[PDB]
Ligand SMILES: CCC(=O)N(C)CCOc1ccccc1Oc1cccn2cc(C#N)cc12
Ligand SMILES: [Mg+2]
């Protein structure tokens with residue numbers, strides 16, 4: 001009933017972000033959602049003396065439409081507020097619960113409401129948008145879980161007491177619940193917590209396994225007959241990998257090429273050359289030496305289209321000091337097109353990133369910006385949105401991570 | 403007539419006070435005009451005489467563009483000090499997105515701003531003063547009670563008020579369409595023209611009850627409507643006629659205004675091109691700097707004048723028919739599109755000629771054009787169109803598959819209308835057997851800018867060409883050009899240049915660089931080319947020898 005005073009960081013005004021344009025289908029859905037949200041008092045219409053704006057989108061989490069607010073800009077402008085469980089990444093199972101509906105029972109500081117204003121756009125500038133602001137704690141605002149935190153601790157304290165070895169981490173609108181139980185015991189423990197949440201008036205509708213995911217090691221080709229070209233590729237790849245693993249050598253491998261040979265000439269792999277390569281497959285097995293996570297610095301993710309539905313990614317903070325690497329595969333399954341694939345990959349990397357470090361990475365996306373701005377919501381399911389930019393994949397980065 | 407609408411609360415920017423701009427002295431003629439206008443406005447409640455305490459002022463002026471007088475106020479200072487507002491609409495509806503209506507009426511709101519009240523606590527900051535004869539006496543203090551013309555908040559607060567005021571009328575007439583734009587209303591219906599005039603008369607009297615005067619049924623603008631550069635006929639729209647100047651010299655400014663008018667014409671004139679013309683502004687040092695016209699710009703402008711000769715129109719929108727877009731290639735880098743529902747009844751047209759990069763290829767550009775059409779369709783019609791494209795599935799599938807970048811390709815049907823869109827060449831994915839292997843290198847003195855390109859092949863051929871005023875990057879491409887030049891129809895090339903590899907693997911078919919355009923011609927003439935990369939200065943063999951050669 002009583003609100004919590006909220007302020008912007010000193011010397012900052014609220015967000016003024018453009019509303020992207022939407023299909024009539026998505027506008028139609030947003031007007032239905034917002035009409036009921038207003039009926040329930042969760043938002044109210046606003047006048048022209050409110051200059052602020054956050055974009056809104058229609059997505060699907062099901063066949064009914066959901067509404068997503070991109071509070072990235074507001075979140076940057078309110079970060080003022082108030083240890084991330086390192087064991088969560090270890091647990092055998094981790095299940096994610098959408099608890100974002102808890103927020104809508106909480107008044108939002110009346111002085112801050114203007115900063116949450118948003119617009120439902122019209123088609124072809126016929127009308128100006130319909131304009132609302134938030135009366136309650138909105139999903140996606142990083143202030144919402146901070147304000148609700150005390151209530152959340154209260155509702156969870158019983159359940160944590162019964163289950164001292166179960167890890168519960170909150171990030172934005174989601175609870176991450178991790179156990180070492182057998183899967184059936186795990187899902188039962190989840191169902192209890194869901195039942196406990198519901199009967200305390202906190203509604204709730206994805207299980208991960210962080211114990212399995214590993215950081216990919218570099219893979220060198222294994223061939224029956226090697227040509228000059230194959231040895232050149234091998235030498236180039238191993239040259240690349242030696243910025244990372246000191247111990248790699250190419251002396252014996254490149255010796256096999258001394259001369260000026262036709263590209264397709266078959267080079268037998270001599271004994272010393274095979275020894276060097278076998279040793280190099282061994283060096284590529286171990287993990288790197290001094291790569292640690294600095295929580296002050298941003299996480300960056302890069303993604304490469306590998307073809308045939310495959311995508312490689314790296315998360316790092318300093319170039320060539322990779323905290324994690326991975327490769328995602330996609331089943332053609334009718335469509336599974338490039339954007340659907342990239343969009344799913346981004347969500348998986350972000351989830352993994354939230355589980356391991358508790359923050360989302362900043363993506364370098366291999367796609368034209370406008371193409372992304374156009375289609376990313378056709379497949380977006382998360383309730384969060386990471387930062388991203390747009391880049392042009394280098395030529396050899398692709399084949400070296402393949 | 404001031405309306406009983408509620409006022410929007412207005413605040414000054416926090417930590418600023420009201421303007422105190424002292425009034426400039428005025429000729430006794432102008433002082434007389436103001437006093438009579440101000441008394442007439444006082445009569446109507448639009449402004450009020452204020453005490454001595456109000457410490458604010460904003461300069462006032464009197465003009466009559468050479469009959470009547472108008473009062474003009476300079477709110478520049480006050481504007482700077484008042485809070486921001488939700489931006490009044492900028493974008494305007496596009497005629498190709500209007501739905502055909504049987505009757506459309508154009509209402510102008512007389513003195514829109516003066517018809518709406520200004521919230522009370524903000525009225526003090528609008529104080530102005532009519533100068534006394536020569537400061538002989540004290541002047542007249544006045545303040546505003548309605549939205550002043552030229553103040554920062556008037557456009558948005560007016561539009562907000564108009565919207566609220568409309569709601570109740572629109573409620574009881576869901577069969578009448580009302581566009582709101584600045585101080586205009588455009589009211590459309592398919593009712594019998596008789597009861598349509600009935601409903602217009604109702605709406606006018608509803609606005610009058612709320613303080614908004616509207617034109618009589620004998621002063622309501624008649625079609626075809628001159629609106630925002632357009633002609634809106636009852637069954638077609640087109641742009642208002644374009645006049646391209648003829649000049650012996652062209653300044654940066656003349657060119658800018660020229661690319662403007664051509665851009666305007668491309669929304670319905672198929673074929674407009676502006677690439678070579680706007681190349682002329684790549685430096686655009688000053689708006690006055692004269693810019694010599696290249697030959698290509700001359701031909702571009704000449705061809706545009708030919709298109710403008712014929713007259714052209716667009717059609718309005720039918721939500722029940724499909725939406726269809728076709729794209730035609732229109733020269734190097736430049737593309738043209740039409741959007742329509744009826745095979746020759748265009749809704750609108752447009753262009754796309756962005757390189758967005760030093761080198762590209764046709765499939766990349768067509769995919770970008772499809773992007774811009776998609777964004778535009780969403781904006782204008784809230785849906786994406788069907789595409790009819792002069793490119794076969796084989797071509798496009800191969801490209802987007804091999805393309806390292808993620809790409810969305812809509813449903814389209816192939817339309818066989820040359821010039822079709824094709825991959826002009828494709829590099830080999832594997833080295834070629836029986837083809838000569840050229841080990842190329844280039845080098846340039848980063849100081850003297852002299853260079854060489856060289857090769858060494860497996861058949862024992864070697865060669866070095868000298869280069870002047872060049873760069874390590876330009877030579878690395880030149881070495882590749884050389885090997886193309888001196889090879890048979892099949893060739894393996896090995897380079898140590900990530901720069902040069904990156905450019906060639908991208909498989910461009912058009913470039914800003916003549917050297918890259920030369921390599922491209924070679925690549926087409928070739929039957930098979932395989933390009934391979936090795937790390938430099940690692941003694942690989944072939945690469946080491948041509949490095950020794952060229953680095954000597
Ligand atoms: C079919 C026959 C026609 O004549 N128009 C033009 C298309 C009909 O669309 C309408 C629908 C409802 C209300 C007004 C309409 O017209 C305008 C729409 C948007 C902006 N407008 C500016 C003017 C002026 N000056 C008129 C309109
Ligand atoms: Mg429209």
Ligand SMILES: [Mg+2]
Pocket residue numbers: 756757758759
């Ligand atoms: Mg460009």
Ligand SMILES: [Mg+2]
Pocket residue numbers: 843844898899938
């Ligand atoms: Mg070199």
